[PDB]
């Protein structure tokens, strides 16, 4: 019985690690898009103030 | 291109935010309503999506609301037994001529939010409680 | 306050949208397909489900045949439409249909029995207190916010152009063309055989539709684009099938939308969409054409290809006299614009006088909709 | 030297469907 | 031996799940901020066009 | 002399037929198979043959693996095609290929590189002075003798329908079903496994194909035929294997070709051949449907099952409106019709101008076929 | 295995000795991950040799024949058949399915039967199917340790279900409809 129990817990751990990795990558992409947004913000602000 | 990005922003913000706001509030209301009726058997659910997967709690809720004796739950721990129990609950609902559309055992077992909430709403609206 | 928000349901050939009156965006959007199993079931013990509706039909598209109840703006199988409406009311919005009035949309020119049948179904099966039928192109002009203009609406089944001047519509200048996204999807399935890719069944039609949504655009000049594509392989893209295989379409990116402007590729004698818009403008009176040229409004999901606005502006400017200006008004969220217009129609104070009551239906039969709806 | 209707191959996951 | 190993595996799984949960919450907040910033960009762009 | 005879080669998935232009019958007919030895030869001095091409490969099926260069109308292996064409030119016809023009046939819808590869091989290797490529079902209409009708060609590779009215072909009405004879052979093997007979090797596939050719027919009423075959044993036949074993085909004789009308037996959701023909008719215009109903032409070897004409006529009459004439035209030699009409195409005087010259191929490359044929 | 054991000199021809050869195959056989390297290694050294004891007390040595016998599963041309291997059969059965469901079938390959218990079938099968499949699809071979009895165990799962009480073939149904009722009732 303990062999199958350890198998189940190990599979769940591997799945959780995969989900954590893809969440971190998505967070990096979101931060990069947020930076590009404020770049566009000041260039449009310069055009409008002229 | 850019217009596609703007449309993606519009849908992803507005439609998703309004939809899941409504599901959150309705889920809390439905969870409280179910917990009101399930105290007679002294069973309590903390999450509406997770606790209805195995089908035992749906059978007990129908047991309380109908007041009649449903058949035996299938003794098991697998996916097949969960499908069997949810199918038994849906068959008892079909016995009372309660009209459900797009309702399957695998949908309730897999944990679809919209279909579980719709099933609870159909239980509240169309099903009548015996006293 | 005793004001109950009226459900707004936009029904098209492709997708069904649903929400409440006064909201900014629809709560539920899902494809309008009904699927049925096509293989043997051997795992005894699982539950039985006769039909699949909406997103669940798309999720399990492998073992199902999918059928659209609405074809060319006309619904053919009424039972599937009833199933879709039941799923919309009970599983998507979680509301009781007898509490709220329901506003429905339809194409301008269609068989007269459709309005009567939806009126009968909504008043008998769903027990709604009131209902109304509106034309989608007018709702687009509500969503634009301008009283006058010409509205072209192209969806999954039907294309139609109407002119309106100061809230007055000209019924003799309304034009309907049966060219839409489903014909473009079929043409893309046909022309993908040249590169060696074969798509036959309905799930493959959904895959080809996704490919068309991802990788299609409209060329400003068709001959220039053809020469450029023949010269070099810079104008190529790669798509990944669900089974891992990679396809490369290349030249076929701008040939599928070109059938919108030249319907001779599909074997149709009828003219293009720009020609239809110009003919609808020319059918109007003389001194409102100046206002109609400057207020051209695009709507529908079919008008979402990149480069449609510039190409249509160039073609209409070629047709029109050079002395006055033509501009194309394409909002970024045009795909939902029809529904948005309906919400505004459900918010006005005078529109509470325009509902078709249940008592009026009981007196007048299903024929009251022709009297009380445009 | 009436048309045939479309037919579907049977299911076995449920025993019978009567009413 | 198996009863000794299962404790460590379960503890590692629990703490991986906690890391996944906090990463998901951070990703949600970042996505909301990015959407708000891009909408703010669009408003000023439309004003400049007018 | 002048105006030398131009040879015509019809290649399908099943057989290759080659012959001169003026003759009413092909000189050479042989299956398109290329076999290679499995086992290790042990006798020194027996002589070494690397590959077997044509009839002697069908003779020595035991010690070879049979392979097909054509699958579903597309040439998968091109070295095998070079072997087939060399054996056709030098062993069956024994004529010089560089001094006669060559006519070739192909399926309507296929990958576009196939025509270019045929043109490049025909010009670069065999050095033919001219060549042309034509659609098989168009040549079937030449063999029919009329310029108005719809052609339904069913071969070993594919099944295709095309309507031609007054010498004009409608490209949008062409349909290409993928059901063919090889699928029926595989289904016959699968249903022959029910009685205890097992056929697995590639050599035994030819035996199963011969059983299909000799002991199959299309039932007029399938479900009545099932009842009749279940009631008694009068619908039984006996076949002798090459080793002397005797098998009894029994019930399966009308179950193999019935899959042509109901493809759901193979797991395909596509419509039957009768519905494909009816849909190809209905895609045409209103005025030309009356002439297309009365001139339906059957072609291809696969349509030589007995009783297929009456069944097809009954199904189309059931689908069509009751007030029209429906008659099915089935030549007794239709297996060669694609060849025969092609020979007529090589006899006309106006056809000499549309040969693809060697100079044109040198100037334009292999793509010139897309400009010159069809 | 009998045919290749004749190659070393040991003769087995009777039906009683076939059981001895079967026991030898069950005890001293395995599947090589790479066949050519394993043949080269077995030719180079004698580290792969094993010893077996006959029922009469004689001692035989297998050696090279340990991995050649199971290899015929993946290369049927050793036996004279022209059919494809088990990996190609599984891949072909996957390719016959629809495009939309192929990913789930790739991720849920299940092994069963007593033949699937040579040491190293799972790794070799995963490697071969991964070689055939596209790179983006990821292969997942599932093999429970007690797979030899799985065909029984699911049956014990099947007969205990509540729905299955309506799926039997009754004695009355057979008495009414002859022995041909099994085609209608069973898949
Ligand atoms: N972003 C897009 N780019 C190109 N085509 C699209 C896009 N979105 C949707 N479509 C096409 O538009 C169709 C959906 O139109 P829709 O607005 O749903 O029509 P209706 O609402 O009248 O049914 C789809 O069939 C699809 O082919
Ligand atoms: N007498 C017959 N009766 C029924 N089927 C036949 C007969 N002769 C040939 N066939 C079928 O037709 C196929 C050959 O078709 P064929 O006309 O050679 O196609 P193609 O010429 O395009 O290769 C064979 O595979 C066989 O199954």
Tab-separated table of N, CA, C and O and ligand atoms in Angstrom, chain B residues 4, chain C residues 10-17 68 136 153-158 181-182 184-185 209 212-214 216 299-306 334-336, ligand 1:
chain	number	residue	atom	x	y	z
B	4	UNK	N	-7.078	44.108	-32.784
B	4	UNK	CA	-7.256	42.810	-32.142
B	4	UNK	C	-6.794	42.848	-30.691
B	4	UNK	O	-7.429	42.248	-29.817
C	10	UNK	N	-28.363	38.206	-27.894
C	10	UNK	CA	-28.010	38.368	-29.296
C	10	UNK	C	-27.728	36.994	-29.887
C	10	UNK	O	-26.802	36.298	-29.446
C	11	UNK	N	-28.526	36.610	-30.878
C	11	UNK	CA	-28.431	35.312	-31.530
C	11	UNK	C	-27.925	35.510	-32.949
C	11	UNK	O	-28.587	36.161	-33.764
C	12	UNK	N	-26.755	34.945	-33.241
C	12	UNK	CA	-26.227	34.930	-34.586
C	12	UNK	C	-26.033	33.504	-35.067
C	12	UNK	O	-26.339	32.541	-34.360
C	13	UNK	N	-25.529	33.395	-36.296
C	13	UNK	CA	-25.219	32.079	-36.842
C	13	UNK	C	-24.056	31.433	-36.100
C	13	UNK	O	-24.060	30.220	-35.865
C	14	UNK	N	-23.058	32.226	-35.719
C	14	UNK	CA	-21.867	31.689	-35.092
C	14	UNK	C	-21.934	31.546	-33.586
C	14	UNK	O	-21.770	30.444	-33.058
C	15	UNK	N	-22.178	32.647	-32.879
C	15	UNK	CA	-22.090	32.670	-31.428
C	15	UNK	C	-23.338	33.302	-30.830
C	15	UNK	O	-23.987	34.152	-31.443
C	16	UNK	N	-23.661	32.874	-29.614
C	16	UNK	CA	-24.765	33.418	-28.841
C	16	UNK	C	-24.201	34.230	-27.684
C	16	UNK	O	-23.302	33.763	-26.969
C	17	UNK	N	-24.721	35.446	-27.513
C	17	UNK	CA	-24.303	36.348	-26.449
C	17	UNK	C	-25.507	36.696	-25.587
C	17	UNK	O	-26.626	36.812	-26.090
C	68	UNK	N	-24.875	23.425	-36.626
C	68	UNK	CA	-25.336	24.769	-36.315
C	68	UNK	C	-26.844	24.845	-36.515
C	68	UNK	O	-27.323	24.563	-37.618
C	136	UNK	N	-30.388	44.006	-36.182
C	136	UNK	CA	-29.035	44.142	-35.649
C	136	UNK	C	-28.339	45.401	-36.157
C	136	UNK	O	-27.562	46.029	-35.424
C	153	UNK	N	-23.240	45.268	-41.589
C	153	UNK	CA	-23.067	44.241	-40.572
C	153	UNK	C	-22.881	42.901	-41.261
C	153	UNK	O	-23.765	42.453	-41.999
C	154	UNK	N	-21.736	42.265	-41.023
C	154	UNK	CA	-21.432	40.957	-41.584
C	154	UNK	C	-21.072	40.007	-40.454
C	154	UNK	O	-20.127	40.264	-39.702
C	155	UNK	N	-21.820	38.915	-40.340
C	155	UNK	CA	-21.587	37.955	-39.282
C	155	UNK	C	-21.142	36.600	-39.788
C	155	UNK	O	-20.300	36.509	-40.686
C	156	UNK	N	-21.701	35.536	-39.213
C	156	UNK	CA	-21.331	34.190	-39.629
C	156	UNK	C	-22.255	33.647	-40.709
C	156	UNK	O	-21.885	32.700	-41.411
C	157	UNK	N	-23.445	34.220	-40.861
C	157	UNK	CA	-24.381	33.712	-41.843
C	157	UNK	C	-24.860	34.702	-42.885
C	157	UNK	O	-25.217	34.301	-43.996
C	158	UNK	N	-24.870	35.993	-42.556
C	158	UNK	CA	-25.533	36.990	-43.387
C	158	UNK	C	-24.737	38.292	-43.361
C	158	UNK	O	-24.042	38.601	-42.388
C	181	UNK	N	-18.822	34.501	-42.891
C	181	UNK	CA	-17.620	33.806	-42.466
C	181	UNK	C	-17.634	32.313	-42.724
C	181	UNK	O	-16.571	31.701	-42.861
C	182	UNK	N	-18.821	31.701	-42.780
C	182	UNK	CA	-18.890	30.263	-43.027
C	182	UNK	C	-18.459	29.922	-44.448
C	182	UNK	O	-17.756	28.927	-44.670
C	184	UNK	N	-16.373	31.724	-46.187
C	184	UNK	CA	-14.928	31.934	-46.182
C	184	UNK	C	-14.197	30.747	-45.567
C	184	UNK	O	-13.127	30.357	-46.047
C	185	UNK	N	-14.757	30.165	-44.504
C	185	UNK	CA	-14.165	28.972	-43.903
C	185	UNK	C	-14.179	27.799	-44.877
C	185	UNK	O	-13.189	27.064	-44.993
C	209	UNK	N	-11.422	27.212	-39.031
C	209	UNK	CA	-11.939	28.500	-38.576
C	209	UNK	C	-10.966	29.178	-37.618
C	209	UNK	O	-10.755	30.395	-37.694
C	212	UNK	N	-8.152	30.562	-39.671
C	212	UNK	CA	-8.569	31.789	-40.341
C	212	UNK	C	-8.596	32.967	-39.376
C	212	UNK	O	-8.225	34.087	-39.742
C	213	UNK	N	-9.036	32.735	-38.138
C	213	UNK	CA	-9.020	33.810	-37.149
C	213	UNK	C	-7.595	34.216	-36.790
C	213	UNK	O	-7.329	35.395	-36.528
C	214	UNK	N	-6.665	33.260	-36.773
C	214	UNK	CA	-5.301	33.578	-36.359
C	214	UNK	C	-4.515	34.274	-37.466
C	214	UNK	O	-3.888	35.313	-37.231
C	216	UNK	N	-5.152	35.306	-40.972
C	216	UNK	CA	-5.694	35.886	-42.192
C	216	UNK	C	-5.687	37.405	-42.110
C	216	UNK	O	-5.873	37.981	-41.034
C	299	UNK	N	-19.478	46.648	-38.655
C	299	UNK	CA	-19.920	45.861	-37.516
C	299	UNK	C	-19.802	44.381	-37.846
C	299	UNK	O	-19.656	43.992	-39.007
C	300	UNK	N	-19.864	43.559	-36.807
C	300	UNK	CA	-19.826	42.123	-36.962
C	300	UNK	C	-18.420	41.561	-36.822
C	300	UNK	O	-17.415	42.259	-36.969
C	301	UNK	N	-18.359	40.260	-36.532
C	301	UNK	CA	-17.071	39.614	-36.344
C	301	UNK	C	-16.335	39.365	-37.645
C	301	UNK	O	-15.111	39.205	-37.653
C	302	UNK	N	-17.065	39.317	-38.762
C	302	UNK	CA	-16.428	39.096	-40.056
C	302	UNK	C	-15.603	40.306	-40.482
C	302	UNK	O	-14.624	40.166	-41.221
C	303	UNK	N	-15.949	41.494	-39.991
C	303	UNK	CA	-15.212	42.709	-40.309
C	303	UNK	C	-13.972	42.901	-39.441
C	303	UNK	O	-13.479	44.030	-39.333
C	304	UNK	N	-13.457	41.841	-38.822
C	304	UNK	CA	-12.334	41.940	-37.903
C	304	UNK	C	-10.991	41.598	-38.536
C	304	UNK	O	-9.984	41.567	-37.821
C	305	UNK	N	-10.944	41.326	-39.837
C	305	UNK	CA	-9.663	41.066	-40.478
C	305	UNK	C	-8.837	42.349	-40.522
C	305	UNK	O	-9.393	43.439	-40.685
C	306	UNK	N	-7.519	42.258	-40.355
C	306	UNK	CA	-6.679	43.453	-40.492
C	306	UNK	C	-6.673	43.964	-41.924
C	306	UNK	O	-6.599	43.190	-42.880
C	334	UNK	N	-15.988	46.115	-32.209
C	334	UNK	CA	-17.157	46.083	-33.078
C	334	UNK	C	-17.893	44.752	-33.014
C	334	UNK	O	-19.108	44.723	-33.246
C	335	UNK	N	-17.189	43.669	-32.664
C	335	UNK	CA	-17.766	42.328	-32.677
C	335	UNK	C	-18.974	42.205	-31.758
C	335	UNK	O	-19.915	41.468	-32.066
C	336	UNK	N	-18.972	42.920	-30.638
C	336	UNK	CA	-20.079	42.888	-29.696
C	336	UNK	C	-21.017	44.078	-29.835
C	336	UNK	O	-21.983	44.168	-29.065
H	1	LIG	N1	-10.567	38.122	-34.870
H	1	LIG	C1	-11.146	37.622	-35.987
H	1	LIG	N2	-10.519	37.669	-37.182
H	1	LIG	C2	-11.088	37.173	-38.295
H	1	LIG	N3	-12.303	36.599	-38.324
H	1	LIG	C3	-13.040	36.485	-37.197
H	1	LIG	C4	-12.489	37.004	-35.939
H	1	LIG	N4	-13.409	36.769	-34.986
H	1	LIG	C5	-14.459	36.156	-35.583
H	1	LIG	N5	-14.241	35.988	-36.899
H	1	LIG	C6	-15.188	35.350	-37.841
H	1	LIG	O1	-16.492	35.859	-37.569
H	1	LIG	C7	-17.408	34.807	-37.270
H	1	LIG	C8	-18.185	35.165	-36.012
H	1	LIG	O2	-19.043	36.260	-36.311
H	1	LIG	P1	-20.162	36.718	-35.255
H	1	LIG	O3	-19.935	38.161	-34.883
H	1	LIG	O4	-20.256	35.647	-34.199
H	1	LIG	O5	-21.481	36.613	-36.163
H	1	LIG	P2	-22.922	36.476	-35.472
H	1	LIG	O6	-22.734	37.097	-34.110
H	1	LIG	O7	-23.845	37.261	-36.373
H	1	LIG	O8	-23.133	34.983	-35.464
H	1	LIG	C9	-16.603	33.534	-37.094
H	1	LIG	O9	-17.171	32.491	-37.888
H	1	LIG	C10	-15.209	33.855	-37.585
H	1	LIG	O10	-14.968	33.159	-38.808
